[PDB]
């Protein structure tokens, strides 16, 4: 039954991605639930790019969830719907998982004696909110975030990954409404506290880095440049093409030289349609800074 699913996955996979698939079958059998989680974890991190995920995840999430950490279950589902460009699909799978955790805790709590399951709750709701924002059902999203915020404060502490996921959703909503100041401020909190998960790659830094820089350029009160440099996002990478021109704007501000600033911006006005229309802001900002 499951073995048939594993064989399909191996045939489509690369020889290099064969040993990850072969480890799932044996470890499940061997009832090593530690390795069952480890093998899986490697897979979702990077082989989420490939469609391999659809067949392996959904089946494993709907079958053999109970065994591994709950956190590990919701982490894979997250990976699957990242690359998913369908919202009917996304909404379905969430509602289904939520029901499963509810059952699971009836046994598990006594069995281990102690084991949290409230981790999975919050993350589900954070994902659902976000689904609604992209669907541009902004109103639903607003009240779900608010509720999470209240819930969260009753807890003294949560994982890095929990507050990083709250923050990520909130930052998305703010750039949608083009509340530039609030996007940037919440984005700072996100960087500091960041998931130890390595889903965040160099390309994901770059994507986030264009928006963060735009919000602060058009401001007249944002002066958190020193914090920016030191944060992972610009720390590891400065030497891409996005960070050639954009970082030079940034430098030009800091040295407080308007002659350089003028030169760069004219070229960037044709290329960038955000900078074309916000000319007035860019000049005001540099003035107040010096």
């Amino acid at each position: 039954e499951i073995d048939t699913i594993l064989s399909t996955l191996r045939m489509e996979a690369d020889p290099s991605l064969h040993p990850l698939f072969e480890q799932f079958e044996k470890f499940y059998e061997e009832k090593l639930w530690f390795q069952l989680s480890e093998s899986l974890t490697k897979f979702f991190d990077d082989a989420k790019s490939t469609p391999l995920r659809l067949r392996l995840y959904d089946n494993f999430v709907s079958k053999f969830y109970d065994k591994i950490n709950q956190l590990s279950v919701v982490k894979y589902l997250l990976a699957s719907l990242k690359d998913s460009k369908d919202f009917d699909e996304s909404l379905k799978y969430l509602d289904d998982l939520k029901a499963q955790f509810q059952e699971l805790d009836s046994k598990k709590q006594r069995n281990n004696g102690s084991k949290d399951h409230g981790d999975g709750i919050l993350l589900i709701d954070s994902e659902i909110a976000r689904t609604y924002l992209l669907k541009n059902d902004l109103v639903k999203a607003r009240d779900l975030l608010d509720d999470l915020e209240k819930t969260l404060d009753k807890k003294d502490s949560i994982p890095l990954r929990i507050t990083n996921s709250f923050y990520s959703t909130n930052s998305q909503y703010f750039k949608f409404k083009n509340d530039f100041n609030s996007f940037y401020y919440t984005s700072l909190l996100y960087l500091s506290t960041l998931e130890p998960s390595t889903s965040i790659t160099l390309a994901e830094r770059q994507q986030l880095a264009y928006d963060l820089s735009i919000s602060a350029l058009l401001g007249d009160k944002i002066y958190n440049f020193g914090e920016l440099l030191h944060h992972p996002i610009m720390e590891t990478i400065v030497n891409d093409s996005n960070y050639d021109w954009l970082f030079q704007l940034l430098n030009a501000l800091t040295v407080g030289d308007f002659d350089k600033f003028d030169s760069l911006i004219k070229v960037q006005i044709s290329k960038i349609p955000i900078l074309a229309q916000h000319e007035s802001f860019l000049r005001q900002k540099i003035c107040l800074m010096t």
């Binding site: 009832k31 090593l32 639930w33 065994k67 950490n69 004696g113 102690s114 084991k115």
Partner: protein
């Protein structure tokens, strides 16, 4: 067993949930802990047992010396499985736990369940081993987590400890494959073990 105080170290690393012993290994170990405690009490009433953790960053005293299975099980009924073994820290602390005693004639013994490989420098544990033995603390390893996914490095350490002591250290090997954890332990020396006393 006569005039003996034995602290059980329960280790509920992330390899405690491994379903190798039915239904899970974690629940298999409760049965094991109940097994050891009742047997040693009935044999000698001066036998006492406390319960400490090998898990988390810093150990937790759940229970003191007792001839009460209720006191041990209440603490056991609620425990985390996401803690992790830190053997080196644990060894020095177990000794400290052992200074208070129903009476001093009782021996110093640790029985420790092991569900995961060592998480510490190998070389350090040899040095700690020889600090324990001056004060005559002997340490019996029910081994089954080291030989899941790593080679057996425990033999070196058991040899180092072994000296004339109130009791001797023992290596008792239990196969990690299904056989029910309490069941191997009942067939292993636990009360058929012996010292140099």
């Amino acid at each position: 067993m006569v005039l003996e105080a034995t602290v059980l170290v329960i280790d509920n690393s992330e390899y405690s949930r491994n379903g190798d012993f039915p239904r899970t290994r974690f629940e298999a170990q409760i049965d094991s802990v109940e097994f050891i405690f009742q047997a040693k009490r009935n044999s000698n009433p001066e036998n006492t047992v406390g319960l400490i953790s090998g898990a988390g960053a810093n150990p937790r005293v759940l229970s003191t010396f007792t001839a009460e299975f209720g006191k041990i099980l209440a603490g056991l009924h609620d425990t985390q499985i996401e803690g992790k073994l830190h053997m080196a820290t644990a060894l020095q602390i177990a000794q400290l736990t052992l200074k208070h005693r129903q009476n001093k004639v009782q021996h110093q013994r640790i029985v420790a369940f092991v569900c995961s490989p060592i998480s510490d420098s190998r070389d350090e544990l040899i040095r700690l081993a020889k600090t324990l033995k001056k004060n005559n603390v002997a340490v019996d390893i029910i081994n089954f987590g080291e030989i899941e996914q790593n080679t057996e490095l425990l033999d070196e350490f058991i040899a180092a400890v072994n000296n004339p002591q109130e009791e001797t250290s023992h290596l008792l090997t239990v196969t990690p494959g299904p056989r029910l954890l309490y069941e191997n332990i009942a067939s292993s020396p636990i009360i058929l073990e012996e010292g140099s006393s």
